[PDB]
Design a protein around this ligand. Structure first.
Ligand SMILES: [Mg+2]
Ligand SMILES: [Mg+2]
Ligand SMILES: [Mg+2]
Ligand SMILES: [Mg+2]
Ligand SMILES: [Mg+2]
Ligand SMILES: [Mg+2]
Ligand SMILES: [Mg+2]
Ligand SMILES: [Mg+2]
Ligand SMILES: [Mg+2]
Ligand SMILES: [Mg+2]
Ligand SMILES: [Mg+2]
Ligand SMILES: [Mg+2]
Ligand SMILES: [Mg+2]
Ligand SMILES: [Mg+2]
Ligand SMILES: [Mg+2]
Lengths: 191, 195, 345, 139
RNA sequence: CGAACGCCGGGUUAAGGCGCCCGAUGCCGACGCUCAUCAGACCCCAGAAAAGGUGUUGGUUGAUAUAGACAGCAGGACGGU
RNA sequence: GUUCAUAGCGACGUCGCUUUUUGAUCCUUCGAUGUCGGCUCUUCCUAUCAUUGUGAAGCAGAAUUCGCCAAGCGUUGGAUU
RNA sequence: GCGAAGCUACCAUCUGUGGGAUUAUGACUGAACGCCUCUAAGUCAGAAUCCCGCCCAGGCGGAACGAUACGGCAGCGCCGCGGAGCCUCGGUUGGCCUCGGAUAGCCGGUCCGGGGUCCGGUGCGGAGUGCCCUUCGUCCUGGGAAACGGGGCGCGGCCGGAAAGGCGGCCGCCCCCUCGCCCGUCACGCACCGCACGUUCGUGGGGAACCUGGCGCUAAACCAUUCGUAGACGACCUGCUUC
């Protein structure tokens, strides 16, 4: 109903350097650099504080619909800060029945190659996003590790695995089988 | 004379209602960069609508039917057809003044290119509304020269920057010639009547 | 309505405008895409459909019943004498397509090409390409002759090569050449252009471009039959014995209210002499012809790895309605588009 | 971004309409779309005005929210709004424009002689400047 | 729906309308509601309801919230039995 | 419908659509619009029978059934009239 | 009774081909609504669908190139001319260019295009403005600014522009100018006697006649006939050297 301004408080830790050149937020920290395009919303992002690094998100008029975005912007900034000081780690335990799933990762963590999936002789090769890596969890039964800096590209890479493994033309109440995401954690664990 | 209009971000209809009037009067208007002309509305509805135009053909012979053009310069030329009395020798001479070029020909590289402020996406839309590019639409439906335009348009944009950087050098020369004086005697008159 | 026995539709609505073509040397509507990796090579040829023979073939196809056995097949023979490269044409990628930038010919152009340009060779005074030969000769005319090649490197993106079949090594009556254009799919534009300049006025072999069991497509123009009726053209069904006004017609051309004959309604279009591109016909063999008198005259053709006999190219008594093969023949699989003595590509 | 806000105590230029070209001082916002303004100095009667009608400035004032005419005037006379405005360049840009609108025939003649001679002095001196530019910097 | 007619010049209007066809909004017009992957768009008039929407935007009749509730996070659920 | 109102059905009630049955009407044709069925051939509709991709079950697999984007391609051979 | 060539049979044989945006759907991230969410912005997977390839036909659509009329006068291109009468008319200074942003972009600027810095802003390093500009001609006539000259029958070189370029840029020489401008003394020029289409593009465009100089060009179609890879008739593919 054209409410006046609502704002959000984003406090920034000392690990990183943040920089906006418009509505293009550059966040540069210990686990590399990162930058995402907030250039499509009409929301003013400004920052303040000598070394104390306070970033305010601001929208003046808007709607119930338009004042909804001002927190999504606030929350997508959040996950970069988790994703640049720590990184994300996804633990994907491979659930299977009788038929054994054997997994290798093909070349340096890009391609993931799935063999003998449920008696599918079809080689099931799913490639990963630019900026993400894969691993097999050692001392651990058939659980998979994906790490990155951005929660889209990590979880897009996890999603491409768990939909390429789909039990088709049979009952899904039986055959509960495939690679599935378990825990959504950080690279530098529990910190 | 020669209304060399740009195509950066005009809306289709809002530009169309102004060109059709200004070409019935004799003023030759040449619309350049016709690929980047926006359409207000969804990205999916417009390729839903223009696809629905592609079904509109004649059963018994589709050769004698609605000639569906695909290039965005020709999409706009057929738009202006709807706004003229095209079946009369009042509009039939009118379309022969309107020339349209998707991308920029060599005569019209260098003549200055006007912009209608009344027909821009900047003005005419509440900015949260969505939008679609007629070049984006035309490559997706039939037209095959989006890549060939993209090569040639970078070829002039790279060629334009080396000139404006060289012309901005020239303008720095004359303001150093401003700062050298024996001209304020003439500038007494100039300042008292609109510097 | 609702025919009560629904059928698939007769004829091709894709091959619809069944016109006798305005050329019968079949042009190439779309060459393969050029590619920066692979070395400089041509993409097209000409031939003359000589005739057909069998081939008894050892078959190695694991997983079929045919394997390790011997098969008779229907096999054509296309005589392909060597092409002579004459010209070089440049093409600019524009927003209207490939604009022919300019052409550069060679100098001592053979008279079979000069017979291509005129209509009456006997009437004419042979005066085509006299003052163009002078452009090579004049040494201050050279500078704007090879300024072409500077532009041809620079702005031309696709280079296509003009070449013709020799006619003095054929049993054909016509003695006129067939000019072409052959796109070169080499790397950068410079080495496409320099390999072409390297080999103007040279007898480009057939075997240098093609290769055995490279599965290769044929563009040619079909047989000519003339204005034939419906049931022989479109293979629609004959009306029965009892029908007044005949048997070979179509009974219902349209409905009432679409008051117009549709362009799908089967009607007497002229059979044959159209243009076709048949795809995926495997070359078996390329065999040379008639070496000089060290061996005093070797024929030794159709002399494969299990026969070792003095056999000819042509059958005993020659190919019917062709003549006699004395050139490099490309021995193709299956029935090929065109009559005997038809120019193929 | 948004260096100037509409504000209790912001002087505001007026673009279109009855009260054009003069300054108001925004008292308070009525509702979203017009706001009660008052210029004692500019002789504008205390009244309402739409936000698109006006035109923001770069000065502010200190008077209370919903104040009377005398209490704006005391903010006005201390700040010297009338003198401090006219020596800004967007106040210059209005004044040099009204010269152009009020030219006469004789004054276009005196400009035209001074528009020629001033341009030609520069025109050869730019040639002389680029002579020394291209002669020295070609080594 | 205006409106009832000899031949015409000027003025003004009715019903109607003023993006472009097409005379007129080339007004710095007004306060708003609505986004459709089937929009919507003017008397007779030329395609549709019962039902439903945590799509919004209002409005009424209610209950709990500064003896801090609805949510989440944290915790407990023992005793004759 | 073992239990289970609604996976699949649904009484009593009620709101619509459709112009392939028919009925009702008589507006057009009486100086004629040649009015059954088959055969031959074309296009279109979707309210989908099979196919491509999916969703749901009282879907273990097997066979089925219930809906979805959907007309691109198919929907025969005969005895009787 | 067998039967060539020719036409033919699913009655012989061969060939029948991949990409892009997506629907239905399933999610990923995430508010609305502290938690939850496929959706509100953002994104991802996705098909006999749709669209283009590939394939057939090629427009009152366009390129590139070839050669272009002897014989006797003739005829033909350009290059520079003056003369000449006829038409189809429309115009009355030109503008030789940053990309792009909008909850923003502009300018000047040591250091390593960027960082830093600085001014501008309901845009004045402005397309509401900027430039050739109102200059009627010329003489007398003095002062500024001026030393580059400034036009051109000039000629010569060079590269710069191919997306529909023939348009532009530089010097060297080549005859003259220092009035190629501004302020100011000076006096004439038709001063056609109140009045209409005046002023330019423009030595426009097209056409056929003609003097005049300077250079070059000396053909090709169609029919006839022959062929018959083609044919209803046309159309088309072909032969036709004096060996
Ligand atoms: Mg099953
Ligand atoms: Mg069909
Ligand atoms: Mg093509
Ligand atoms: Mg025939
Ligand atoms: Mg009979
Ligand atoms: Mg009434
Ligand atoms: Mg009008
Ligand atoms: Mg509601
Ligand atoms: Mg009746
Ligand atoms: Mg009746
Ligand atoms: Mg009645
Ligand atoms: Mg017999
Ligand atoms: Mg036979
Ligand atoms: Mg969706
Ligand atoms: Mg097409």
């Amino acid at each position: 109903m054209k409410t006046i301004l609502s704002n959000q408080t984003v406090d920034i830790p000392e690990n990183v350097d943040i920089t906006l050149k418009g509505r293009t937020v550059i966040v540069k920290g210990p686990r590399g650099t990162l930058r995402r395009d907030f250039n499509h919303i009409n929301v003013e992002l400004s920052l303040l504080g000598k070394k104390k690094k306070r970033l305010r998100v601001d929208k003046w008029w808007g709607n119930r619909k338009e004042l909804a975005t001002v927190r999504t912007i606030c929350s997508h900034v959040q996950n970069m800060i988790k994703g640049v000081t720590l990184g994300f780690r996804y633990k994907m335990r491979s659930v299977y029945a009788h038929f054994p799933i054997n997994v290798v990762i093909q070349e340096n963590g890009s391609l993931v190659e799935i063999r003998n999936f449920l008696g599918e002789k079809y080689i099931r090769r799913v490639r990963m996003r630019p900026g993400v890596a894969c691993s097999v969890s050692q001392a651990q039964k058939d659980e998979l590790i994906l790490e990155g800096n951005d929660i889209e590209l990590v979880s897009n890479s996890a999603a491409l695995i768990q939909q390429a493994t789909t039990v088709k033309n049979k009952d899904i109440r039986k055959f509960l089988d495939g690679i599935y995401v378990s825990e959504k954690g950080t690279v530098q664990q529990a910190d | 004379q020669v209304l060399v209009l740009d195509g950066r971000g005009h809306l289709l209809g809002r530009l169309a209602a102004i060109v059709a009037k200004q070409v019935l009067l004799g003023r030759k208007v040449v619309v350049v960069r016709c690929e980047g002309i926006n359409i207000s509305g969804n990205f999916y509805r417009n390729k839903l609508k223009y696809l629905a135009f592609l079904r509109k053909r004649m059963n018994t012979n589709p050769s004698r039917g609605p000639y569906h053009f695909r290039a965005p310069s020709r999409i706009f030329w057929r738009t202006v057809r709807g706004m003229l009395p095209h079946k009369t020798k009042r509009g039939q001479a009118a379309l022969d003044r309107l020339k349209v070029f998707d991308g920029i020909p060599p005569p019209y590289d260098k003549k200055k290119r006007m912009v209608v402020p009344a027909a821009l996406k900047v003005v005419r839309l509440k900015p949260t509304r969505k939008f679609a590019y007629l070049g984006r639409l035309a490559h997706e439906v039939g037209w095959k020269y989006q890549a060939v335009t993209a090569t040639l348009e970078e070829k002039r944009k790279e060629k334009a920057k080396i000139h404006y950087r060289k012309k901005k050098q020239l303008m720095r020369l004359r303001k150093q010639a401003e700062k050298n004086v024996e001209k304020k005697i003439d500038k007494y008159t100039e300042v008292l009547k609109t510097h | 309505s609702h025919r009560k026995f629904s059928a698939p539709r007769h004829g091709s609505l894709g091959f619809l405008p069944r016109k006798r073509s305005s050329r019968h040397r079949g042009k190439v509507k779309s060459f393969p895409k050029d590619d920066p990796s692979k070395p400089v090579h041509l993409t097209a040829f000409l031939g003359y459909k000589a005739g057909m023979t069998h081939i008894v073939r050892e078959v190695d196809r694991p997983g079929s019943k045919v394997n390790k056995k011997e098969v008779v097949e229907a096999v054509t023979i296309v005589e392909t004498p060597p092409m002579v490269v004459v010209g070089i044409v440049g093409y600019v990628e524009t927003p209207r397509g490939l604009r022919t930038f300019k052409t550069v010919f060679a100098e001592h152009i053979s008279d079979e090409c000069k017979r291509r340009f005129y209509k009456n060779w006997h009437k004419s005074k042979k005066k085509a390409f006299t003052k163009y030969c002078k452009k090579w000769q004049d040494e201050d005319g050279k500078k704007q002759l090879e300024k072409d090649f500077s532009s041809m490197k620079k702005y031309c993106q696709v280079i296509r090569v003009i070449a013709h079949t020799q006619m003095r090594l054929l049993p054909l009556r016509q003695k006129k050449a067939h000019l072409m254009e052959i796109q070169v799919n080499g790397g950068t534009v410079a080495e496409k252009l320099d390999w072409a300049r390297e080999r103007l006025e040279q007898q480009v072999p057939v075997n240098q471009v093609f290769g055995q069991d490279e599965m290769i497509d044929v563009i040619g123009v079909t047989k000519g039959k003339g204005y034939k009726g419906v049931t022989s053209r479109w293979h629609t069904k004959k009306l029965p014995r009892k029908t007044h006004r005949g048997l070979r017609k179509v009974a219902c051309i349209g409905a009432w209210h679409p008051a117009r004959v549709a362009f799908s309604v089967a009607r007497a279009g002229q059979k044959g002499y159209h243009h076709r591109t048949e795809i995926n016909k495997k070359i078996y063999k390329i065999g040379q012809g008639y070496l000089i008198k060290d061996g005093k005259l070797i024929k030794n053709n159709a002399s494969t790895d299990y026969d070792l006999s003095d056999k000819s190219i042509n059958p005993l008594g020659g190919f019917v309605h062709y003549g006699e093969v004395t050139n490099d023949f490309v021995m193709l699989k299956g029935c090929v588009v065109g009559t005997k003595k038809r120019v193929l590509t | 971004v948004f260096r100037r806000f509409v504000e209790v105590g912001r002087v505001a230029y007026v673009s279109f309409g009855p009260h054009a070209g003069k300054l108001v001082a925004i008292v308070d916002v009525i509702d979203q779309n017009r706001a009660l303004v008052d210029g004692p100095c500019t002789q504008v009667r205390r009244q309402a005005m739409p936000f698109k009608c006006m035109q923001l400035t770069d000065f502010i004032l200190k008077f209370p929210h919903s104040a009377h005419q005398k209490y704006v005037r005391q903010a006005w006379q201390k700040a010297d709004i009338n003198t401090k405005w006219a020596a800004t360049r967007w106040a210059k840009k209005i004044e040099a424009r009204e010269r152009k609108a009020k030219m006469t025939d004789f004054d276009r003649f005196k400009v035209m002689k001074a528009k020629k001679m001033r341009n030609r002095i520069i025109k050869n001196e730019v040639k002389k400047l680029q002579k020394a530019a291209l002669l020295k910097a070609s080594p």
